């Protein structure tokens, strides 16, 4: 559980959008 | 310019004719480039000198 926290959210968009960049 | 190069270009293609794709490719490519005219990376990778 030694995980801080919000890796997701952020990583989850920048992943998501990141894809979105893959739209170009 | 660019454009000029293009309409001149893929235009000048026309004429000839072929698997369009090609044209599409530019075409849009143009559009784009235009847009760029409008604004740059506003969409996608902004061109940068």
């Amino acid at each position: 559980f030694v995980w801080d926290e919000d890796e997701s959210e952020a990583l989850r968009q920048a992943r998501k959008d990141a894809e979105l960049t893959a739209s170009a | 310019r660019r454009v000029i190069n293009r309409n001149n270009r893929l235009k000048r293609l026309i004429d000839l004719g072929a698997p369009e794709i090609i044209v599409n490719n530019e075409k849009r490519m143009l559009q784009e480039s235009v847009d760029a005219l409008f604004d740059n990376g506003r969409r996608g990778r902004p061109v940068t000198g």
Partner: protein, 1109 residues
């Protein structure tokens, strides 16, 4: 004391300092020196213990050197760290315009690894930046000036951190290895581990810990108590270092086949890579410093160690928890606690080589990181220690560096100390450093410590104070960027007569004794109780009986500049530092004077000008004349030691350097020889010990108003001269180039009937404004004209030529006599920039005979404009005739503070006037004490006092009572301060007694021509054709927007509008009404926002079409 050319500005020493004046200045240099590392410094350091110090060099060398391929088969190394020698009086470069330097040789050595073989080669390296006796570096006869950027010591650093959430104290610490990345542990909210490194979420540490090999046991074991962590062993869910590791590793990249790399390599690398993972030895050093660690360990490395890692980690845990000290195994203990940025031990400072060194460092690095490159490719065999050299890029930078070295900043050669100040000047900002757009006041913030560190007071000033400064006074600074205050390290009512350079810290542990403090002549401060800063610098009282250390004097975190004016204790710091900075802005007019009063700072300060031609040998004098002087170095030995004059500042001033004595006399090294600039009788001539007095008068000393004599003129008291260099090149290009003849088109005669054979006149020649100058000229063009003309020319035979009639001509507020002749040719080999074949640069005198209105002043910040000039006569004036120097409004001081001005001035007339204690029969009590000796003042004579030490009021006052009544043994003066002159006009008596006195002041590098401008018209942005402001231009002031709003508050419309149009850039009306004007007539009524017109267009442009109707 200890002063060869000493007089006596008799002072008020109520005290004693066994200590005496350091040398300041030393500073860097030493560095440099050390940086160099001279068998000097070598010796230097070398002394005072100091194991194996090193010229900031080596190191360099060894921090990389030796060398080798990646094939592990070609081995290079170095040696001959050193240089050659310059080639100039520097002075040469000075005139000769290049910079001063001396060559570098060094002798690396390659070696095969195959056979292994030999490639030494005492290679030249670089002629090099060669310092000055002013410890400086005047690039191409031109120096800036570098100060060091303050720098809180880097390292893994500590704090509590709360959470209003629960308010829990999620303490923590970072890691910050020089060049080594980051990784930090942090009191977690909920359990546990502020794990993640240089920005990586979080982990269970041990996953890293264990990751290196750590049975969850081994910890709990050594770390079960140590319970919060136990949670760590809980939620840590995952196991297998590796399992982790690799998994981590992903946490790293992320995403990558966890090769054994993942299992270790870079990991170690990561921060076991002094190859690249490379904190700071001093830190390294610190570290131990952090924690009585290995300590007994003259160490050095980036040697990261999980060891200490965890160590200080459980430090964390233990703390968050509250816990005093504790000793790790072996490692002697450490009282737990967070950290601070704020305090200064937190907080080192930088220095040349250091820099440099860094600079350089990449320099080689760079240039270095190449031979490698080439080493390889540079086939084996015949590839000499040479073959692969090219520091070029280094100096390129380096050299360069200066260019860009924004911190090197041209020595304001406006006065000496001014230049000084510049020296000692100190901040922590800029290149890589802060960007004031990011810093909490705290940056500027006060704090205890601070004392004996830098002038409390002074600082920048604009959005700028709390940002920059210098040192305090004495306390040298760490071989590692930390002050070195010695102290009255007391001992049993018997202070230990002993320096103790101190880094605040430590110390901090210790006891704050008090200078100004009555000992029983033994250390035995005669009281049982005393005060003293404490833990929080808790300036706390206490029983004398207990401290370890007192002090080193009074007055210390002071600055020199600080150190300059008494009465403080009565006066606005604001106002102060004000005057402080002020202080500098004097202007070495001409006369040379010193305040008959003034502390000791003074030339004993001034001496630290270290400027005046000043003795070199107990030699008898020798031939003398204002260029130099032969010097009977009594070893037979001599040397017509020189002396400079008439040579500009950064600010247009002579090279003057006035002598002292007599080609025959006899004296001894280090003693004076000849002043020159800010150099009254061996001493910053700095003002005018000047009567004046107290009234606000007829509204003329009102609102800053200022009422001013005149005799002055005549007296002349107020002037020097100032220096532009005067340049104008001969160029090369298209239509031809830029000739410099003397022939000219339909030029007037005399206008030419003046210059030299082929242009500009001859040295020391007078002028005015406009005044043509150069003998230039250039091809004009080729594009026809109206027959009309030509014709016209045919009409008047004035067969026009065709060359760009071109040259130079004097602008405004300009005249004097010819000087410079830096006429330097490309063509004549005189290297110069493109398309040019030569250029001169010239100068002209102008004695600035002081306008009133302006501004001057002296001490007590007590600045002062210069309102009105006023003939003598017409002037309140001694009942004994003699009138003022000027007069002085009242009012401010009250809401200001600086009355010493009063006192000091009382004083003034006093001294100026002298006296004698008629103590006679007995003692003026208040007398009964003090520099007795005085007893009197031979009406007017040298007088100093201590800073936070000097006589008192009553005394002083009573001194008032005392006297050296004048000629008619008279004293128009009152034992009171207020006499009664009358009117140099209407004349009669006054209402009531007259406060008055005297005051030396200083004069200003800031007046009209500094700023005397407007602009009718001229150039205009070839783009936004706005007033091309410029030299030739007056700029033509810009305008504000509020303003406009003002209009609004009226609505003159037009007006504004107009503007917008007009002087704005109304191409037309500009032209147009410009005409009008020209034709003077019901002006071309305001037109239309034109351009605006564009718009439209601009719009359309995008299918935008629309319209009003």
């Amino acid at each position: 004391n200890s002063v060869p050319g000493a007089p006596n500005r008799v002072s008020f020493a109520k005290l004693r300092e066994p200590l005496e004046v350091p040398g300041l200045l030393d500073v860097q240099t030493d560095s440099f020196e050390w940086l160099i590392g001279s068998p000097r410094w070598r010796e230097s350091a070398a002394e005072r213990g100091d194991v194996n110090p090193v010229g900031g060099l080596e190191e360099v060398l060894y921090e990389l050197s030796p060398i080798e391929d990646f094939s592990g088969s070609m081995s290079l190394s170095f040696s001959d760290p050193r240089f050659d020698d310059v080639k100039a009086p520097v002075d040469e470069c000075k005139d000769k315009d290049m910079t001063y330097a001396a060559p570098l040789f060094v002798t690396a050595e390659f070696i095969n690894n195959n056979t292994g073989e030999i490639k030494s080669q005492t290679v030249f390296m670089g002629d090099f930046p060669m310092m000055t006796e002013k410890g400086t570096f005047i690039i191409n006869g031109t120096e800036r000036v570098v100060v060091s950027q303050l720098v809180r010591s880097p390292g893994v650093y500590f704090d509590e951190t709360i959470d209003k959430s629960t308010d829990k104290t999620l303490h923590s610490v970072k890691v910050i290895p020089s060049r080594g990345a980051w990784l930090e542990f942090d009191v977690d909210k909920r359990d546990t581990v502020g794990v993640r490194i240089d920005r990586k979420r979080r982990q269970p540490v041990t996953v890293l810990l264990k990751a290196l090999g750590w049975t969850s046991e081994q910890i709990v074991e050594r770390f079960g108590f140590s319970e919060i962590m136990r949670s760590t062993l809980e939620k840590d869910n995952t196991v297998g270092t590796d399992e982790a590791l690799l998994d981590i590793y992903r946490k790293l990249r992320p995403g990558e086949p966890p090769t054994k790399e993942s299992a270790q390599t870079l990991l170690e690398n990561l921060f076991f890579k002094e190859k690249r993972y490379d904190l700071a030895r001093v830190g390294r050093y610190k570290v131990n410093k952090k924690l009585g660690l290995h300590v007994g360990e003259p160490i050095t490395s980036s040697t990261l160690t999980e060891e200490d890692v965890v160590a200080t980690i459980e430090y964390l845990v233990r703390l968050h928890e509250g816990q005093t000290t504790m000793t790790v195994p072996g490692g002697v203990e450490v009282p737990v606690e967070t950290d601070d940025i704020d305090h200064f031990g937190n907080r080192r400072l930088r220095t040349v080589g250091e820099l440099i060194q860094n600079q350089i460092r990449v320099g080689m690095s760079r240039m270095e990181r190449v031979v490698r490159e080439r080493m390889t490719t540079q086939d084996v065999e015949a590839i000499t220690p040479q073959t692969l050299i090219n520091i070029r890029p280094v100096v390129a930078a380096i050299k360069e560096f200066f260019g860009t070295s924004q911190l090197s900043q041209f020595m304001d050669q406006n006065n000496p100390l001014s230049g000084l100040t510049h020296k000692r000047r100190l901040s922590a900002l800029g290149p890589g450093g802060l960007s004031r757009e990011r810093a909490g006041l705290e940056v500027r913030d006060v704090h205890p410590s601070h004392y004996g560190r830098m002038c409390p007071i002074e600082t920048p000033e604009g959005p700028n104070i709390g940002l920059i400064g210098s040192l305090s006074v004495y306390a040298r600074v760490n071989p590692f960027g930390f002050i070195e205050t010695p102290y009255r390290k007391v001992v049993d009512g018997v202070v230990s007569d002993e320096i103790v350079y101190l880094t605040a810290d430590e110390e901090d542990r210790h006891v704050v004794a008090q200078a100004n403090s009555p000992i029983d002549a033994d250390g035995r401060f005669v009281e049982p109780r005393v005060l003293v800063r404490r833990k929080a610098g808790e300036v706390e009282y206490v029983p004398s009986s207990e401290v370890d250390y007192m002090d080193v004097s009074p007055r210390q975190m002071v600055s020199v500049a600080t150190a300059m004016i008494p009465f403080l204790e009565h006066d606005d710091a604001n106002r102060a530092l004000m005057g402080a900075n002020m202080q500098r802005q004097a202007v070495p007019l001409v006369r040379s004077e010193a305040p008959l009063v003034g502390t000791g700072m003074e030339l004993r300060a001034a001496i630290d000008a270290g400027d005046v031609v000043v003795a070199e040998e107990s030699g008898v004098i020798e031939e003398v004349s204002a260029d130099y002087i032969t010097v009977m170095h009594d070893n037979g030995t001599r040397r017509t030691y020189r002396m400079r004059k008439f040579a500009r500042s950064n600010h247009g001033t002579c090279a003057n350097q006035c002598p002292i004595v007599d080609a025959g006399d006899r004296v001894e090294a280090g003693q004076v020889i000849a002043d020159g600039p800010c150099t009254d009788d061996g001493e910053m001539a700095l003002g005018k010990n000047l009567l004046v007095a107290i009234m606000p008068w007829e509204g003329h000393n009102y609102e800053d108003a200022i009422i001013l004599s005149n005799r002055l003129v005549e007296e002349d008291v107020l002037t020097s001269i100032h220096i532009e260099e005067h340049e104008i090149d001969a160029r090369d290009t298209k239509l031809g180039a830029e000739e410099i003849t003397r022939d000219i088109p339909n030029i007037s005669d005399e206008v030419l009937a003046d210059l030299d054979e082929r242009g500009i006149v001859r040295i020391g020649a007078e002028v005015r404004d406009g005044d043509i100058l150069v003998g230039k000229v250039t091809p004009k063009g080729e594009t026809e004209l109206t027959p009309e003309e030509r014709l016209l020319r045919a009409i008047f035979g004035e067969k026009a030529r065709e060359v760009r009639d071109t040259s130079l001509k004097v602008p405004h507020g300009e005249s004097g006599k010819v000087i410079g002749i830096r006429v330097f040719s490309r063509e004549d080999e005189d290297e110069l920039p493109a398309g040019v074949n030569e250029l001169v640069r010239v100068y002209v005198a102008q004695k600035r005979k002081i306008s009133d209105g302006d501004k001057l002043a002296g001490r007590h910040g007590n600045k002062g404009v210069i309102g009105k000039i006023l003939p003598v006569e017409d002037m309140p004036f001694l009942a004994d005739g003699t009138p003022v120097d000027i007069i002085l409004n009242t009012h401010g001081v009250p809401r200001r503070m600086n009355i010493g001005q009063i006192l000091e001035t009382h004083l003034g007339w006093c001294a100026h006037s002298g006296w004698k204690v008629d103590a006679a029969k007995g003692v003026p009590d208040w007398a009964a004490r003090l520099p007795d000796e005085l007893l009197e003042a031979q009406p007017n004579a040298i007088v100093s006092t201590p800073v936070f030490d000097g006589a008192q009021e009553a005394e002083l006052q009573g001194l008032l009572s005392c006297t050296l009544p004048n000629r008619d043994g008279d004293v128009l003066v009152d034992a009171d301060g207020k006499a009664m002159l009358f009117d140099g006009r209407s004349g009669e008596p006054f209402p009531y007694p007259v406060t008055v006195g005297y005051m030396y002041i200083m004069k200003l590098h800031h007046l009209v021509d500094d700023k005397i401008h407007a602009r009718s018209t001229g150039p205009y942005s070839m783009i936004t054709q706005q007033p091309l402001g410029g030299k030739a231009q007056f700029g033509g002031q810009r305008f504000g927007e509020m303003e406009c709003w003002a209009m609004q508050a009226y609505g003159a419309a037009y007006t504004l509008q107009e503007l917008l149009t007009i002087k704005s850039d109304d191409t037309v009306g500009r032209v147009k009404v410009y005409e009008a004007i020209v034709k003077g007539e019901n002006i071309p009524e305001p037109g239309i926002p034109e351009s605006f017109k564009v718009l439209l267009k601009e719009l359309q442009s995008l299918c935008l079409n629309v319209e009003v109707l």
